[PDB]
Each structure stands twice: as C-alpha cells, then as structure tokens.
Symmetry: C2
Subunit: 350 residues, 2 copies
C-alpha cells in the first residue's frame, strides 16, 4: 500500500489491458489517493490532462500547489495556468507573465509552458508563431519522468502534424501523425492523428481520406464531440469531391454546418437554395478562416473572380497554405494568368 | 599642431578659400600624423566628400601605423571601399567586420552605415530600416566632426528609406533636415536628388526644379553632373515627354533602360526591342530586373511581365517604383481587389 511503480505507464497499461471499460472509474480512484509529493502524482497530473479528465486534474492541481515538494508545486502551478488559459479565464499576456514569474526549474514544465502556449495558438487559429515556439522544445532534457517524456513527445508529434498540414507539407504531415499513433494509447491523440491524416488527403485520395475519418469515428463512437468532428470532416470531404453528401447537418446553425449545406447545393446546381443558405450566413458573425470559406462559396455561386480574391486574402491572413488551394483552383478555371497565380502563391501576408 | 575639432579647419577653408577647398585640404590632410584625431577626422572628411585620393592614402598609412584606433578606422573604411567597388562580397565584408572586433562607437556606427550604402546601391531595401534604427550616434562623444557628419549621413539615408517606402512627405522632411545640417556638397547633392525623386509621380516642375538646383551647385563636377542628368532623364520618361537627357553613348543598365523607355513612349518598338535585347544579356540586381520586366510588359503588352515586375519590386521592397507596373495593370482593366491584394502582401 502506497507503493508506486517507478513509471506510471505500468498501471495505465494494465488498466487499459485488463479493465478498459472502467479506465476512468479506476484511475480517478487511484490518482486521487496518491501522495501529491510523489512522481506518480506528478505523472497522474499529465495523465489526467492528456485525457481531459478535468475532474481528476483540478484536484491534483489544488493539492500540489499547496504541498511542500517544489516540483509538484511547480507542476500544479503551470497546469493551473494552462487550464485558466485554455478556458479564457485569463488572457495570453497574463499567462506568459504568470509563467515568467514562476522561474520554471524543471525540464518538464519548461516544455509544458511552451506546449500550453502552442495549444492556445492552435485554439485561436494563429499559426504564424507556432513554428518558432515548437522549435524551442527540447524533450531530451527530460530524464527522470519517462511517462511525461513519452506523452509530451506524442503531444509534439500531433502539433507538428497540424503545423505541417497548414503549411501544405502533407507527406511530413502524415509522417508526424503516424509517429504520434505509434507512440500513444491516449484516445485524444489517436483521434486527432486520424483526423489530421484524413484531412491531409482531402485533395488527393478520397478513399484513404474517408478510411481514416471512419477509423477515427470507430474509436470515438460514444464521445458526442469527437463523433461530430469526424462527421463534419466526412461532410467536407464529400463536398470537396462534389459527391452525394449524406453527412450534412440540416438541423444546425453553426457556420461550418451551414457552409457545407451551401457547398453541396452549389455542387449540385441548386443555386436558389444555395443563396438562401448564404442569406443565412450573411446574418452570422464570421472570423477570418470562416470568411475565407465564405468568399470561396460566394465566388462559386456568382462565378465572380473578385470574391475569390477576397477568399485568398483571408486564407493568407491565417497562414492557411492548404485550404487556399480551393480558390486558387477556381481562379485557374476562370483562366487567371499563370504568373499571377504563382505570385499569389509566393507572397505572404505578415 | 591641430585643432581639437576638425570643423575648425573646414569652416575656415570654406569661408575664406571656397574655390580651392580640394587643393588645400589634399595638401593639409596628407601632411597630418595618421595617429591623431585630426587624421581620423580627415578620413571621414575625405569619404563624405568622396575625395578618394585623400581617403585611399589615409587608409593605407593608417592600417600600417601603430595607433590602434587609427588602425581600426582605416581597416573598416577599407572594407567600405572594397565592398562599394565590388572587390569583396557582402558576406566577406560582414565576415571581415566581425573579425575586426570593433571597439570604437564611431566604427560601430560606420560599420552599419557601409552596409546600408551597399543595400541602397544593390536594390536590397528590406533590411535597411531595421539596420538604421540600430545606429546610435550619441555614443560618439569625442569626435564631434564625425558625430555631425554621420548625423547628416543618417538623414540622407533615412530620406532614401522613406522614399522607397512611398512615404514621400517624410522623405522630403528628412532631406530638408539633411540640408540644414550640412555644408558638404556631396550631401547637398543627394538631398536635392532625393527631394526631386520624391516628386517624380506628382510634380514635374518642382521635381525638375530640385534637379536643376542640385545641378546649379555641382555642374562643374562630372560625377554630380551625370547624376542629375540621369534623374532628369528618368523624370521626362515617367512623364512621356520629349527627352533631351538621354545618353545614347552608354552601355550601363540605367542609361540603356531610359533609351528603351523613351523608344516605348514613342511608338519605336523595334528600337526598343533592340535595346532590351542588349539588356537581357546583363546581370541585374532585383530592383533593375523589376524595371526590365516593366519595360518588357509595356513593349509586349503582356500582363505576365507586369506581374514579374511587381514580383521583383516586392523582393527589393521598393514601394515607390512599383507604381509603374501597377498603373499599366490598371490601364489593362485589372481587378481593383487583386491590385490591393498584391499591394498588401509582401515577399519575405
């Protein structure tokens, strides 16, 4: 009793093997009984955060911040900052400021302070500073906690894959997602790895794209949020290839769902229904990448080169080098000059 | 025996013997002990006036002398001279400045200035603004002649940077600051040139008036004479007027481009093609190649050439001259949204 394995993966690996249907129930009861001054408790923290077991995470945090082991206290403090940042309790500026005031000592939290900043960049769609930031992480400095060493490596593979996607560097994108999948048994990371591989194939391989989305759908059947994410991914895939789309949510007023309605109606020369849908979208407040997609759809319904120029403008603003291929193709179909196209490819927004 | 500040001689040579400033200063400067502050000032004096006969003699004697401060000055003015005569590449110049382990704030300032001149002359404008903002003349507190001439240098360069940013009022204000700060003919000349050039697309007569003003104080000097001739030549091609300033006896890129530009302004396309066929076979920096494509786009009426011109103006980060292909594209009915998009995007 109170005896811990030297590496947290042992109890996790057992739980996933022998009792996979009770993983939460078993792990919450185990992690909430750890002495929080211990390496198992510090490992349990990262276990809870990777799976978004917020209920387990919050309790570890509050216990660790108040304990006398400075390592646990520091882990608690910066995971606290990540939860309060990922949920808009605090801004980006005061998180960076709070992180600086910690003078972080451990290599683990030096890595995670950067990961939580990268997650906030992924959240907001702000891809430009992500390359620099993710190059500063050096996980080889983590020598004492191999569980955290390994889980963080999965986190970096998944983020690198997402970065490579937006850079339209798709072979690398798929390499990083495959390294992610080989390295993990955490549902969240498998899910986003299958979603990224499939998205990376959106413009090249319909059947392989679909196959990855369905595999991801298979492992998250009873998670309403992941399930919907894969359905939306499949819906977009079928609109890109201009096929019959049985994934469209017609009972939704989210931007993504309505745009897919319009994209399908446009694909099938249902122009009046399509304008009705874009009528609906004009009364909703769009952000940057949503606007990019909005002008692409308007450019196609009106067959108007101007609206595609607007689409390119907003894709460049968000440093989306992947999805920008959609308006660039339609401009070409309208006979736009080759040199112009290359120029639009080469120039960057900054 | 020397004055503590070099401006004591120059101002007396300028007030009393203005018609023989060169003769008298070539004599005085080459009779200074190269180890002293006056010799270090004479080097800046000679370089700012482009009296290379004084400068290159001081550089030699200062590098082989035993005062370490005079030696450092001489070595980095030598790097300026070799780079500006294409004896060494920019990479070799940067490498050599690093190996010098520069100690004075005067040469920390001038080491950045000579890079700035190289960027200007090579059409590589995007690094200039960051680099110039690193210059801090206040650290120069022992040689006031050098502090004050470097300050004039920074005004003229700031004025040029604003010009290439298409920030034309700010351009003219810095050139005025430069004029008010100097009695050195070289800096007066490039100030009138920059003011005139800032008026190229808006005010023909005031542009020409500044060119003729710079000409009025410098015509006797062949180098300066030619610089205002070329400015007036481009002015009159921009405005598509009869052009009495064309140099038909030159094979420099600048002069050949103005021939082609004039031939195109009139309907003389075969003469223009003859000139451009020659220009094809010359190495261009990015800014020069952008002009080349603009002229090709006008001759061939080919939109892709105009897009290539914009491409190379973006690479050089010239926001002023890019107005030439933009207008031609507007005339060809190009979409306004598209042009605004090209304007807001950048090369990098």
């Amino acid at each position: 009793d109170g005896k811990t394995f030297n590496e947290f993966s042992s109890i996790v690996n057992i739980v996933k093997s022998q009792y996979p249907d009770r993983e939460y129930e078993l792990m919450k009861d185990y992690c909430l009984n750890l002495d929080v001054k211990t390496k198992a408790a510090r490992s349990a923290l990262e276990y809870a955060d990777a799976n978004m077991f917020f209920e387990i995470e919050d309790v570890l945090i509050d216990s660790m911040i108040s304990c006398s082991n400075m390592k646990s206290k520091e882990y608690g403090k910066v995971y606290k900052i990540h939860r309060e940042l990922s949920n808009s309790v605090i801004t980006e500026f005061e998180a960076v400021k709070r992180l600086g005031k910690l003078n972080i000592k451990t290599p683990e939290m030096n890595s995670f302070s950067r990961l939580l900043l990268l997650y906030h960049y992924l959240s907001t769609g702000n891809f430009s500073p992500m390359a620099q930031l993710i190059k500063q992480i050096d996980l080889s400095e983590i020598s004492e906690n191999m569980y955290i060493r390994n889980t963080y490596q999965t986190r970096v593979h998944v983020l690198m894959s997402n970065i490579k996607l937006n850079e339209n560097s798709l072979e690398e994108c798929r390499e990083y997602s495959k390294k992610a999948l080989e390295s993990t048994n955490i549902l969240r990371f498998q899910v986003f790895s299958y979603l990224t591989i499939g998205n990376s194939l959106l413009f090249s391989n319909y059947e392989l794209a679909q196959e990855n989305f369905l595999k991801g759908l298979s492992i998250s059947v009873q998670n309403e949020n992941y399930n919907m994410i894969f359905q939306q991914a499949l819906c977009f895939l079928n609109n890109v290839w201009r096929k019959e789309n049985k994934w469209i949510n017609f009972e939704s007023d989210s931007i993504m769902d309505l745009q897919e309605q319009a994209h399908c109606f446009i694909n099938f020369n249902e122009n009046s229904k399509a304008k009705e849908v874009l009528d609906k979208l004009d009364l909703l407040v769009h952000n940057d990448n949503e606007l990019a997609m909005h002008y692409y759809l308007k450019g196609r319904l009106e067959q108007n080169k101007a609206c595609f120029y607007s689409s390119i403008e907003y894709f460049k603003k968000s440093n989306d080098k992947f999805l920008i291929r959609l308006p660039l193709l339609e401009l070409q179909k309208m006979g736009e000059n080759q040199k112009l196209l290359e120029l639009l490819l080469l120039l960057e927004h900054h």
